[PDB]
Amino acid sequence: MVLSEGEWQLVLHVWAKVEADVAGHGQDILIRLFKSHPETLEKFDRFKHLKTEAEMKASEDLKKHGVTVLTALGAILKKKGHHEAELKPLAQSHATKHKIPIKYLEFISEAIIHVLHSRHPGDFGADAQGAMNKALELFRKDIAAKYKELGYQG
């Protein structure tokens, strides 16, 4: 996986917009994920009892979780590929602590692209979406590498 500098800039450009309202983006993304794939909800004991979008939007746990997820992602994306140090840990965790499947990461990637497109359609075009997809794909592969490198078959 390799993105051009122009492609990383497209990614970083849309990401600055996400940072203008991390909380709102995290809620959109997480709800989109739980609505598209309800089984994923079972992996969160603090808000796995949330059923409606209303209950989801009112959840402080989901909101805070969205902010933590996006913050960690935003930090890895800014590395533009050299994110080993900001990844070794994002791995040891979901590998030994939560056991988050690779397929679920594919689910959240779809929610992220959908939400970014929906909230910023004027700039998040085919080029930007293609670069973000490549970025998240690179991200999934490296995480899967750390898993495998650690015995976990996510």
UniProtKB/Swiss-Prot annotation:
| Cited SUPFAM superfamilies | Globin-like
Any one GO BP annotation for this protein: removal of superoxide radicals
Q: Name the domain of life.
A: Eukaryota
Compartments it resides in = Cytoplasm, Sarcoplasm
EC number of the protein: 1.7.-.-, 1.11.1.-
Q: What are the GO MF terms of this UniProt record?
A: heme binding; metal ion binding; nitrite reductase activity; oxygen binding; oxygen carrier activity; peroxidase activity
Q: Please list the residue ranges annotated as the Globin domain.
A: 2-148
Recorded catalytic reaction(s): these are: Fe(III)-heme b-[protein] + nitric oxide + H2O = Fe(II)-heme b-[protein] + nitrite + 2 H(+); H2O2 + AH2 = A + 2 H2O
Provide the residue positions that the database annotates as binding nitrite. H65
Q: Cite the binding residues for heme b.
A: H94
Please explain the role this protein plays, according to its UniProt record.
Monomeric heme protein which primary function is to store oxygen and facilitate its diffusion within muscle tissues. Reversibly binds oxygen through a pentacoordinated heme iron and enables its timely and efficient release as needed during periods of heightened demand. Depending on the oxidative conditions of tissues and cells, and in addition to its ability to bind oxygen, it also has a nitrite reductase activity whereby it regulates the production of bioactive nitric oxide.
Q: How does it assemble?
A: Monomeric.
Q: Belongs to which family?
A: Belongs to the globin family.
Q: What is the name of the protein in this document? A: Myoglobin
State the organism named in the record: Physeter macrocephalus
